[PDB]
Amino acid sequence: YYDKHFTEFVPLRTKAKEILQEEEDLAEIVQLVGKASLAETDKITLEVAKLIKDDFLQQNGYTPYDRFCPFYKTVGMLSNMISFYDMARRAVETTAQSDNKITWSIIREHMGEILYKLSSMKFKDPVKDGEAKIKADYAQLLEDMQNAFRSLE
């Protein structure tokens, strides 16, 4: 079914599960270490995993916007969150061995508006703002991310 109607959904589903599992694998040891031995690639995983947990997995069912989440919106906003993961992870993987490593603190300060916009993606009210506006809005966040990365790296 998913391949017939969406295609993009399945690899997004897989990546989301891997991120959540890695966060749990890290949380077990981070509780004991104190976030001292974490690599920059792990700090990105931990923070994106939080992004997914707080903005994607939870929703307030007694609101005009989270009372119903049409599937196209769920996969739409997941695509952006995973796209951020891949771009943020690439940004550090290609720079960690260079003469300036893009650590979390650099991307966090540079792209703080993207992280807030990504968290706001739930507040789309599909009844007031229909499919056309939501898809266009999500596309705009994707463009904003891609442009910020080009200026960052």
Partner 1 sequence: VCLFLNLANDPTIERIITPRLALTTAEFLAYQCEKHVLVILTDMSSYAEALREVSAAREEVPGRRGFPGYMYTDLATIYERAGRVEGRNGSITQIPILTMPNDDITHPIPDLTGYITEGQIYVDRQLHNRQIYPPINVLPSLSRLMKSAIGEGMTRKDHADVSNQLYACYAIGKDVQAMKAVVGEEALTSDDLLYLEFLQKFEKNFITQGPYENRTVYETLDIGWQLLRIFPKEMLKRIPQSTLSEFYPR
Partner 2 sequence: KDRIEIFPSRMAQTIMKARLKGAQTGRNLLKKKSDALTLRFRQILKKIIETKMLMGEVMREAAFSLAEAKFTAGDFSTTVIQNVNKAQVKIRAKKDNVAGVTLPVFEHYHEGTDSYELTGLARGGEQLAKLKRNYAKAVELLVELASLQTSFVTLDEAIKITNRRVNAIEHVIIPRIERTLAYIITELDEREREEFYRLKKIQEKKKIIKEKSE
Partner 3 sequence: RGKLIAVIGDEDTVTGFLLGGIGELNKNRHPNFLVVEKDTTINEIEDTFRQFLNRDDIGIILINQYIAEMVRHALDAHQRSIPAVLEIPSKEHPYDAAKDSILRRAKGMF
Question: Nearest distance from residue 33's CB to partner 1, in Å?
Answer: 6
**Which ranges of the chain would DSSP assign to H, the alpha helix?**
2-5, 9-33, 40-52, 71-93, 104-110, 112-120, 131-152
Taking the least distance from each CB to partner 1, the nearer of 17 and 50 is 17
Q: Please, which residue, 29 or 139, has the CB nearer to partner 1?
A: 29
32 part of the interface to partner 2, by CB under 8 A: yes
If one asks whether residue 31 binds partner 2 (CB under 8 A), the answer comes out as yes
How many angstroms separate the Cα of 13 from the Cα of each of 62, 63, 82, 87? Answer: 26, 26, 9, 17
Name the minimum Å distance from CB 79 to partner 1.
18
39 is an interface residue for partner 1 by CB under 8 A: yes
CB of 50 to partner 2, least distance (A): 17
Which of partner 2, partner 1, partner 3, none sits in contact with 139, Cβ below 5 to 8 A by type?
none
**CA angle at 138 for the pair 137 and 140, rounded to the nearest 5°:** 65
What would you report as the CA-atom Rg of the chain, rounded to the nearest whole angstrom? 16
- Answer for which of 22, 47, 137, 144 binds partner 1 (CB under 8 A) is 22
Does 59 appear as a known binding residue?
A: yes
Q: Pick from 97, 98, 82, 102: which is nearest to 150 by CA? A: 102
Q: Examine residue 33 and tell whether it contacts partner 2 (CB under 8 A).
A: yes
Is the separation of the CB atoms in 88 and 150 below 8 Å? no
Numbered residues of the known binding site for ADP: 59, 61
